[PDB]
Each structure stands twice: as structure tokens, then as C-alpha cells.
Design a protein around this ligand. Structure first.
Ligand SMILES: C=CC[C@@H]1/C=C(\C)C[C@H](C)C[C@H](OC)[C@H]2O[C@@](O)(C(=O)C(=O)N3CCCC[C@H]3C(=O)O[C@H](/C(C)=C/[C@@H]3CC[C@@H](O)[C@H](OC)C3)[C@H](C)[C@@H](O)CC1=O)[C@H](C)C[C@@H]2OC
Ligand SMILES: [Ca+2]
Ligand SMILES: [Ca+2]
Ligand SMILES: [Ca+2]
Ligand SMILES: [Ca+2]
Ligand SMILES: [Fe+3]
Ligand SMILES: [Zn+2]
Lengths: 119, 359, 171
């Protein structure tokens, strides 16, 4: 369902667990097979650059499954690529106006915070 | 409440009446001051108002030659990419177009979510100042890129596909290059293995979508080599693997062109610069920079925190005027409304509580 | 304290008699002090409720008459829109009511800001949230009164499967 390619390791000690608040920068793109070397990242559909850092409780199912599983395997400060197939993202339904049916998503993510801790 | 954040300025919720839209000074032209503040307040025109501006601009543009020729003084501007709030700052620092000559090198649209405001306001300025403000075509002024990026969606959201189509026809009428003050070739992109003399630009049939190959492509797409000026290989042109089309061109290619055509420099845009501009290796013959890149979109994509710049050429001085980004209103991705955005989560939250209650 | 006719609760809802019997058992589990009504604290004592950003909206919607507690009729009516036997309109009406805090049949600018802020917290700055609320109203408000009617709401969300969001598989 989800793969996580590490771009910069985090501190290798502080890792989110179920119920933690996490703080994340991200860029989310539609999968594009013609673009290895851009990590198969095609058109951007969202990012924190244009809005502000992203905050959520993790591991309790309120974000898509690929995030909820992969983030528990990051350490504070880590920057990675998450490749998420549609059944670990928005599935058949997609997200109207933004994510097509059966879309594979590619996120570049950076774990900036876990509860009170900051990278 | 009636409103929670009273300090946040609300947008202009209604389209202008025709009485508001048309200038009281010259009733054959739009009211510029009105349009400028209306778009600043995120206001829309009626479809008929928008089509009128686009079509009136098209009639002016299609009468112009492929290769414009105009003298200094003039303010030269690079990419804008829909960043209307920075376009306002650009005019503040570059001079009021009521009394200032302008040349834009293209890439008015895409990425920024105020592309149609940039086009409608620049076109309204062209209608008011047809003999002192000029607009070139960039690689984004075409169907393929506006469909791939954001401008087609923006037009369909704010206006209609008819407005989008009218913009596409207008973009086909945009001139491709200029000679400025009999000294500078001004183009969006770069040189071409098929650009030998200025007659080659004049021969182009510009009234069409840019081809994937050829001189018309290269004028809009080409870049200087990354090691421009310090090359090892003698090649004038090499395939541009960064763009996936067109070419990189070398310092010897630029010098050869300039010498053959009695010009001093190539002024172009198309590549983002941290400083808002870049000056390349000076020629031996004159000592002017052989190429200048000008880039007028600060904090490009809300990402790069770069400065923008314009070039203000007057009394034989190239004045470089940088500016920083200006805040702009927020839009959800793809112009989504807040009900479409929130309802999936609303459904999850509600049913999570019902489940807890029932099970 | 009160009486009610079970057959009328049945016929007035999407539920059959067996379902309403089960719902009565769920209502009694919630009615901890056996008063015959669900008080605010009886909802909020459920962790899955008190931790949910829409808890005060769901309680308010259940409390149809706004009297401060939820009787069995109100409990059944509030759940009835989520039945798989329910129709498209009543699920849209329930979704509309999430936003319409003062129950007057229109979503105002401030109501929409407040309810969205419950869910988004500091993911948007107040100015950002206000801007996209303002533009949604600008786009949805077809008659120009500054607020969003049920008809104007349903037009905006035509391409969202609100019915799928607003259904529970098992009762
Ligand atoms: C009142 C507002 C709603 C509220 C919105 C916010 C707090 C603002 C927050 C920055 C989201 C963005 O707002 C600009 C925007 O981010 C996306 O572009 C995106 O990058 C994305 O994919 N993300 C966000 C980062 C974590 C992973 C994933 C996500 O899991 O997001 C979650 C998501 C949509 C889950 C659905 C919920 C419905 C289930 O049915 C579905 O089940 C499959 C999964 C988000 C975080 C929800 O927890 C919270 C909300 O929805 C979505 C493509 C659409 C989403 O807007 C909704
Ligand atoms: Ca009770
Ligand atoms: Ca009540
Ligand atoms: Ca209301
Ligand atoms: Ca209205
Ligand atoms: Fe550009
Ligand atoms: Zn370009």
C-alpha cells in the first residue's frame, strides 16, 4: 500500500506513536510514471508552502491509511517520499475536483514536530 | 456570528455594472482604476465584460508585427505567472503605465491563481496604451501548458470555457520578439539553431499554437547553457534535457548572433532567479552582457522566496529594480469551495460519533 | 415524566419496529441516570464524542427543539437521516444542519467560519479561512442576500456523494 523512501534521516530517536500530534510540511503530487528522477511526482495538488504547516493526530485513522502507517515509521526531522496506492488513499471515490478515482499519490514529507518537540 | 474576522477585507462579491465598467474619461475603454481595485478585491467581471477586453486586445495584438521595434526609455519585465498582487508592486516600482513605456516578455499565466486578473488588467492597459505598452508571448501562453497547469481550470472556475478559448486565440496573436532601442533582442526564451538573422523571426507564422520543434518553439523555450561563458565543448546548441524540448545555447552562439545582427545583448526571461535577474558574460566587442535574464515573479510558487526584478533602461543606464513578494489571498487547491472541501471529513466525524453511540 | 407512541416514531422515520426496539436499548445505555432523556453530559461522557471536533454540532442537531436535552423521538429522528433506506434530500438536509448553527435555514458567513474552524484548528490562519469562506459565499449566494440557503447549498455540492458520507451500514 505505501512505500517510504528516505531523503534525509531524522534524529533516529523520536518517533510518532498512535495518538501523538504531529507537525508536517508536505507537497502532494499525482503519480506520473514518465518521471522517475522526480520520484514519479507529476502535477502538484497541494502543499504546505502555500498555506502553513500541517497538524493532525496520527495513527487514529483521521488521515489516509498510507500516512497513518508511514508516519509512525519516521523520526523527528526526517524528510521522505511516500508513494501511496489508491486503496491506501482516496480509492474509487477520489476527492471531487482534486483527486481522480483510483489515483496513486506521491508526497514529499518532512516531520517537523511530534507533540511539543520540534526538529 | 455574522462575520468572525472583521479585520479581513471581504472580496468584491458582485460583478461591475456596465456603468462602472466603462471609463468616464473615454467611454470606448474600460475604467482602469476601477478594474485595478476590483481585481485587487478578488472581484469578477461579467462574461461579456471579460470577452470584450480579451477580444479588443486581440484586435490590437494581431495588427502588430512578429518582431516589435521600440525605443527606450522603457521598463522590461519577465515572468508574472498569475501573481496579481506582485504585478501591482511591479507597476509601483517600474512606473505608472500612464507615463511609462513597458515591455513584458510573457508567462502571464499559470501557477499563480490570479492569472485571469493579470491577463484582463494587462490587456486593459494595452487597450489604453497601445503605443507605449507591449506584450510578448511566453511558453505558457498556449493551450498545452494552460491545460497541464492551472489557467484552464482557473478560467472555467471564475468565468467559462468561452473566456478560456478567447484567451487562447489572443495568445496566438501575441508578438514573439522585440528589438529594443535598436540595441537588444528581447524574447521570452532563447536563441535557436534556426535563428540566423532577424528576418527569420519575421518569416514565422505566429498565429497558431507553438510547435514542439522549430524556431517558434525555441524563441519561447530555449535557455543559456548552465556553464554559459565557461564552456569546454564548442557546440552552439545542445538538446535541452531540462525542458525536454528545444535547446541550450552557448556564449559563442550568443556572440555570433549579436555580431551578425549588430545587437548588444539578448534580454530574456523564462528562468527563475534568486536575485530576480542574472547578467551573463560580457561580449568582447562591446562589453555589454551577452545575455540578461529578468524574472518578475517574487517568492515564485509561494516556495522560492526569490526577489523579482524589472529592468528600467533610460539615459543609457540599465537600472535594475528588485522587489520582494506581497501577501496575497488564499485559495483552496483547484479553487475548491469550502463545502466540497469539508463535507467528506464532516461525514466521517458525524458517523464516528453515531457509531460510538450505537456500538 | 412522559409518554410516546412507538408506532408513530416508526412510521415517521426510516426505521422498522425491530430497529426502533434496538434503538431504545441504545438510548437507555446513553441515558445513564434513567431520566428518559439524554443530557449534554451523557453525550460528552463518551470519549469518542468529547474528542470529536463536531460533538457540539451533533448534540445540537439531535436536540431538535433546542430545549437542552434529547428525548427518544429526537434521538430516532436524528439517526433516521443516516438509514440506508433514507433519501438523498434528507441526507443533504442533515449536512446543511451541521453548518447552520442558529437553525434559521441559512448558513451565514460567521456560522460557516466557526464550524470549519472546529475541524481545521490552526491548519489555516484565521485570515486564510475567512478568505475562502468569503469566496465560497460569493460563489454560492445566487440571490445575493449574503447567506446560503438550502437550495444554494445543494447546488454547490452536486458532485459530492453526500449520501455516501451520511449513511450507516448497520443499526
Ligand atoms: C473542514 C476541512 C476538512 C479537513 C481539512 C483540513 C484539516 C486541512 C488539511 C490541510 C487538508 C487539506 O486542505 C487544504 C487537503 O489536503 C489534501 O490536498 C492532501 O494533501 C492530503 O491528501 N492529505 C493532507 C495531509 C495528510 C494526508 C492527506 C489527508 O488524509 O487529509 C485528510 C483527509 C482529506 C482525509 C479524508 C477524510 C474523509 C475520508 O472519507 C477519507 O477516506 C479516504 C479521508 C485531512 C487532513 C482530514 O483529516 C481533515 C479535513 O478533511 C487532500 C487531498 C484534501 C484536503 O482537504 C480536505
Ligand atoms: Ca438522562
Ligand atoms: Ca430536545
Ligand atoms: Ca443560520
Ligand atoms: Ca443566498
Ligand atoms: Fe515561466
Ligand atoms: Zn517560460
Amino acid at each position: 500500500g505505501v512505500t517510504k523512501k528516505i531523503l534525509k534521516e531524522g534524529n533516529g530517536v523520536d518517533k510518532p506513536v498512535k495518538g501523538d500530534d504531529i507537525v508536517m510540511n508536505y507537497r502532494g503530487c499525482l503519480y506520473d510514471s514518465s518521471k522517475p528522477s522526480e520520484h514519479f511526482m507529476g502535477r502538484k495538488f497541494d502543499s504546505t508552502e502555500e498555506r502553513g504547516e500541517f497538524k493532525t493526530k496520527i495513527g487514529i485513522g483521521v488521515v489516509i491509511r498510507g500516512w497513518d502507517e508511514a508516519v509512525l515509521q519516521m523520526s523527528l526531522g526526517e524528510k521522505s517520499i511516500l508513494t501511496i496506492t489508491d486503496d491506501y488513499a482516496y480509492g474509487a471515490r477520489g476527492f471531487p475536483g482534486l483527486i481522480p478515482p483510483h489515483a496513486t499519490l506521491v508526497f514529499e514529507v518532512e516531520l517537523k514536530g511530534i507533540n511539543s518537540k520540534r526538529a | 456570528l455574522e462575520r468572525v474576522c472583521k479585520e479581513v477585507q471581504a472580496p468584491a462579491f458582485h460583478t461591475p455594472t456596465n456603468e462602472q465598467f466603462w471609463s468616464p474619461v473615454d467611454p470606448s475603454k474600460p475604467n482602469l482604476a476601477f478594474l485595478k481595485q476590483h481585481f485587487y478585491r478578488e472581484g469578477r467581471l461579467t462574461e461579456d465584460q471579460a470577452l470584450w477586453i480579451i477580444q479588443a486586445g486581440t484586435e490590437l495584438l494581431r495588427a502588430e508585427p512578429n518582431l516589435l521595434e521600440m525605443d527606450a526609455p522603457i521598463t522590461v519585465c519577465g515572468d508574472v505567472h498569475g501573481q496579481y498582487y506582485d504585478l501591482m508592486k511591479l507597476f509601483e516600482v517600474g512606473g505608472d503605465p500612464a507615463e511609462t513605456r513597458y515591455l513584458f516578455l510573457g508567462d502571464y499565466v499559470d501557477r499563480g491563481y490570479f492569472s485571469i486578473e493579470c491577463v484582463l488588467y494587462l490587456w486593459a492597459l494595452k487597450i489604453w496604451y497601445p503605443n507605449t505598452l507591449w506584450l510578448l508571448r511566453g511558453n505558457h501562453e498556449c493551450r498545452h501548458l494552460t491545460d497541464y497547469f492551472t489557467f484552464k481550470l482557473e478560467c472555467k472556475h471564475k468565468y467559462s470555457e468561452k473566456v478560456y478559448d478567447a484567451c487562447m486565440e489572443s495568445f496566438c496573436a501575441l508578438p514573439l520578439a522585440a528589438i529594443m532601442n535598436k540595441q537588444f533582442l528581447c524574447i521570452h526564451g532563447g536563441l535557436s539553431p534556426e535563428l540566423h538573422t532577424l528576418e527569420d523571426i519575421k518569416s514565422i507564422d505566429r498565429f497558431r499554437e507553438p510547435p514542439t520543434h522549430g524556431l517558434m518553439c525555441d524563441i519561447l523555450w530555449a535557455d543559456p547553457l548552465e556553464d554559459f561563458g565557461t564552456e569546454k565543448t564548442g557546440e552552439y546548441f545542445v538538446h535541452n534535457n531540462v525542458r525536454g524540448c528545444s535547446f541550450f545555447f552557448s556564449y559563442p552562439a550568443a556572440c555570433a548572433f549579436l555580431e551578425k545582427n549588430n545587437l548588444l545583448s539578448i534580454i530574456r526571461a523564462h528562468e527563475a532567479q534568486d536575485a530576480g535577474y542574472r547578467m551573463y558574460q560580457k561580449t568582447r566587442t562591446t562589453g555589454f552582457p551577452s545575455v540578461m535574464t529578468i524574472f518578475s515573479a517574487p517568492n515564485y510558487l509561494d516556495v522560492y522566496n526569490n526577489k523579482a526584478a524589472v529592468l528600467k533602461y533610460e539615459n543609457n543606464v540599465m537600472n535594475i529594480r528588485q522587489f520582494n513578494c506581497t501577501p496575497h489571498p488564499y485559495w483552496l487547491p483547484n479553487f475548491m469551495d469550502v463545502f466540497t472541501w469539508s463535507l467528506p471529513f464532516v461525514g466521517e466525524k458525524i458517523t464516528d460519533m453515531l457509531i460510538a453511540i450505537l456500538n | 415524566m412522559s409518554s410516546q407512541v412507538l408506532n408513530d416514531i416508526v412510521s415517521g422515520s426510516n426505521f422498522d419496529h425491530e430497529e426502533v426496539d434496538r434503538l431504545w436499548k441504545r438510548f437507555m445505555k446513553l441515558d445513564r441516570d434513567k431520566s428518559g432523556t439524554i443530557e449534554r453530559d451523557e453525550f460528552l461522557s463518551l470519549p469518542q464524542v468529547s474528542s470529536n471536533p463536531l460533538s457540539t454540532r451533533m448534540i445540537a442537531i439531535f436536540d431538535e427543539d433546542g430545549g437542552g436535552d434529547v428525548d427518544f423521538q429526537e434521538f430516532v429522528s436524528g439517526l433516521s437521516a443516516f438509514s440506508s433506506k433514507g433519501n438523498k434530500e434528507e441526507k443533504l438536509r442533515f449536512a446543511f444542519k451541521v453548518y447552520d448553527i442558529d437553525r434559521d435555514g441559512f448558513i451565514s458567513n460567521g456560522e460557516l467560519f466557526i464550524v470549519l474552524k472546529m475541524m481545521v484548528g490552526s491548519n489555516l490562519k484565521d485570515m486564510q479561512l475567512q478568505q475562502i469562506v468569503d469566496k465560497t459565499i460569493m460563489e454560492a449566494d445566487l440571490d445575493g442576500d449574503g447567506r446560503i440557503s438550502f437550495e444554494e447549498f445543494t447546488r454547490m455540492v452536486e458532485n459530492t456523494d453526500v449520501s455516501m458520507s451520511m449513511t450507516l451500514d448497520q443499526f
